[PDB]
Design a protein around this ligand. Structure first.
Ligand SMILES: Cc1cc2nc3c(=O)[nH]c(=O)nc-3n(C[C@H](O)[C@H](O)[C@H](O)COP(=O)(O)OP(=O)(O)OC[C@H]3O[C@@H](n4cnc5c(N)ncnc54)[C@H](O)[C@@H]3O)c2cc1C
Ligand SMILES: O=CCCc1ccc(-c2cc(F)ccc2C(F)(F)F)cc1
Length: 651
């Protein structure tokens, strides 16, 4: 609906106050119900005004003038609701034209570490709020793990490239603000085996159905039967899958055994039956010799003898023909059995390879081998997935952080090395990545750390904290997963693939290598193919040079399309996200022995000892309900900007 749709697009229930709103409006939530409904209408209506035109700042004044009677009479409540929505980044976020220009007097100094989407989104908010903000970025560009290759007409993303559903997604708004072209991903994903032969549609569907069954069985084991600890070790999804596959093969073999038993028993009965017929034919042969001697010789005792032999001899053929139809009733049962054997195996060798492709796909979506994922919590965020098809960024995802950086004070080539925070202020120490001799010392009232989890995990530490971070924070950093995923960009001068197909799969020959170049993406205006390296392959393939890995790509493509069809690429690009010192991997995952609560602990600010919080955290690894995505990075920056403004400017 209308105001209903605005709540939904803001990830809020249209008919209930959230717990956060209840915190900020206790007089409302404890007061009469009719005022609760007035509150919800004003909130939903204000969200609608913003979402229907997110290129323009929505002021309190303009909200008041577009509310209908009688809501435009409660000026104070409107202001309370508008101020709340703005402070937390539900309206007036991203890039939009200001109506009310910024104050020249800044209040409070914030240093933001890192200039990815979470740092940029927080910076824009803090600046909007009238604070003095500087971002320090170690790279020579903004965007972090949004990273687009651009040369001539060639565009290709080496970092994020997928926008998940638009329903509920804040990137829907940013996409409008930046005029980013999104294209829905077409579903057809043909698979080719290692010999290049396409997988018949029916078998692709059979195997995909098994994959879904296996996943559902792991989830039942985990949540209904509490199979989550394995000899005092947290069980991984990988471990659980292989056990469920093991039981399926065990069940196939048992049904084979029960079938071979039915065969053997039927064969035994057929054997004894023939034996019984042998003895009965020998009995008729013997008796028929006595019909011959009796017929040979006629008085009444001899004639009677013929009638008695003839009567018994027909009776013995009555016995024999009885056994004959029991013989047929068996033989047809035997024939039927050895014509309809149950499954010989659960998964043929080729079937298991195709199944391993779907596991590679799952290792892509989590950026890690399945043996590292928490069985219980790997999909702990799935209640928050957006509705709609997934899309890709046709003109390159870097358009979003480039535009978010407009008007911000950003120091590039500036690597933070130490972060000192005391009950009286903060100092950030950074070195210039071009003259390591050159050192800077930025004073500020608060620090917003958007360092990637991979950087926080680094040992020896890349960034030193003074005082060191609390044990409860370092432990969460150690527990949480930080994955890896890489891409090969192949730029050609002609299209030799199916232009109507966005995706196609290469089925690898072994389990261990299932993530090697398993998925190819056709996304761009120029003749460009992207190949993914996922799972165990991702980290290992970083040690292979660009040339050898491109060769392996071309071998795969020549296997699918033909030797003569695949030219040499004009240009190639190969990501190495784990080796990248400013990322150390691609995105977080819920590791066995972690949980969603570690994402909440990562988000918790640090307060210096004997006081107010000085050190704040954002980044994809700090947002429990939306981890490992660009929108989660964004929402985490909006959240921290609100928490920081509440602290230093007042709610
Ligand atoms: C290969 C790949 C595929 C992906 N798939 C997608 C996808 O399709 N869709 C999706 O939504 N998500 C995807 N993701 C994840 C998504 O890109 C990230 O979750 C998000 O971009 C992270 O943003 P961030 O602000 O948390 O961190 P970052 O973007 O990493 O930003 C942190 C910043 O800190 C900087 N920095 C590091 N060390 C220092 C230092 N010492 N001093 C100063 N600055 C420093 C970094 O250079 C960086 O700019 C993908 C990521 C990768 C790498
Ligand atoms: O190249 C980058 C892919 C990284 C990435 C990670 C997670 C999602 C995602 C997020 C969700 F909440 C639900 C489903 C998915 C997906 F299936 F796409 F992985 C999308 C992209």
């Amino acid at each position: 609906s209308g105001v209903e749709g605005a709540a939904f697009q803001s990830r809020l229930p249209h008919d209930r106050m959230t717990s956060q709103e209840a915190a900020c409006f206790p007089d409302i939530i404890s007061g009469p119900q009719q005022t609760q409904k007035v509150f919800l209408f004003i909130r939903n209506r204000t969200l609608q005004l913003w979402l229907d035109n997110p290129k323009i700042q929505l002021t309190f004044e303009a909200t008041l003038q577009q509310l209908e009677a009688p809501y435009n009479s409660d000026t104070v409540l409107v202001h309370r609701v508008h101020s709340y929505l703005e402070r937390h980044g539900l309206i007036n976020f991203g890039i939009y034209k200001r109506i009310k220009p910024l104050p020249t007097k800044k209040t409070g100094k914030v240093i933001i570490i890192g200039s990815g989407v979470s740092g940029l989104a927080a910076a824009r908010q803090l600046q909007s709020f009238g604070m003095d903000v500087t971002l320090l970025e170690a790279r020579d560009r903004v965007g972090g793990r949004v990273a687009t290759f651009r040369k001539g007409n060639y565009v290709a993303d080496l970092g994020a490239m997928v926008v998940t559903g638009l329903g509920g997604n804040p990137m829907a708004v940013v996409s409008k603000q930046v005029n980013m072209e999104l294209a829905k991903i077409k579903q057809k994903c043909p698979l080719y085996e290692a010999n290049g032969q396409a997988v018949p549609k029916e078998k692709d569907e059979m195997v995909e159905q098994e994959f879904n069954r296996l996943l559902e069985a792991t989830s039942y084991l985990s949540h209904q039967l509490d199979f989550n600890v394995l000899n005092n070790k947290p069980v991984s999804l990988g471990q659980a899958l292989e056990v469920v596959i093991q039981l399926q093969e065990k069940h196939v073999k048992d049904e084979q055994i029960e079938h071979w038993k039915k065969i053997v028993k039927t064969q035994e009965e057929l054997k004894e039956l023939l034996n019984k017929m042998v003895n009965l034919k020998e009995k008729i042969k013997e008796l028929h010799q006595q019909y011959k001697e009796a017929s040979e010789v006629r008085d009444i005792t001899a004639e009677f003898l013929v009638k008695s032999k003839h009567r018994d001899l027909t009776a013995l053929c009555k016995e024999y023909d009885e056994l004959a139809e029991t013989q047929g009733k068996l033989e047809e049962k035997l024939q039927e059995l050895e014509a309809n054997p149950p499954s010989d195996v659960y998964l043929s060798s080729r079937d298991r390879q195709i199944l391993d492709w779907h596991f590679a796909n799952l290792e892509f979506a989590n950026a890690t081998p399945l043996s590292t994922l928490s069985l219980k919590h790997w999909d702990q965020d799935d209640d928050f997935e957006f509705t709609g098809s997934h899309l890709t960024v046709r003109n390159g995802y870097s358009c979003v952080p480039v535009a978010l950086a407009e008007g911000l004070d950003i120091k590039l080539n500036t690597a933070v090395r130490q972060v000192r925070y005391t009950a009286s202020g903060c100092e950030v120490i950074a070195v210039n990545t071009r003259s390591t001799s050159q050192t800077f010392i930025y004073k500020c009232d608060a620090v917003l750390c958007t360092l990637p989890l991979g950087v926080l995990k680094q040992q020896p530490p890349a960034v030193q904290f003074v005082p060191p971070l609390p044990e409860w924070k370092t432990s969460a950093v150690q527990r949480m997963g930080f994955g890896n995923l890489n891409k090969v960009v192949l730029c050609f001068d002609r299209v030799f693939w199916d232009p109507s197909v966005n995706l196609f799969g290469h089925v690898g020959s072994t389990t261990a290598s299932r993530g090697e170049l398993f998925l190819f993406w056709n996304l761009y205006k120029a003749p460009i193919l992207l190949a993914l390296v996922a799972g165990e392959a991702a980290g290992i393939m970083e040690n292979i040079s660009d040339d050898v890995i491109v060769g392996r790509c071309l071998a795969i493509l020549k296997g699918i399309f033909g030797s003569s069809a695949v030219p040499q690429p004009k240009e190639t690009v190969v990501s190495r996200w784990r080796a990248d010192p400013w990322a150390r991997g691609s995105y977080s995952y819920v590791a066995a022995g972690s949980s969603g609560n570690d994402y909440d602990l990562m988000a918790q600010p640090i307060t210096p000892g004997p006081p107010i919080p000085r050190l704040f955290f954002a980044g994809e690894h700090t947002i429990r309900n939306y981890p490992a995505t660009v929108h989660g990075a964004l929402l985490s920056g909006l959240r921290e900007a609100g928490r920081i403004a509440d602290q230093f400017l007042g709610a």
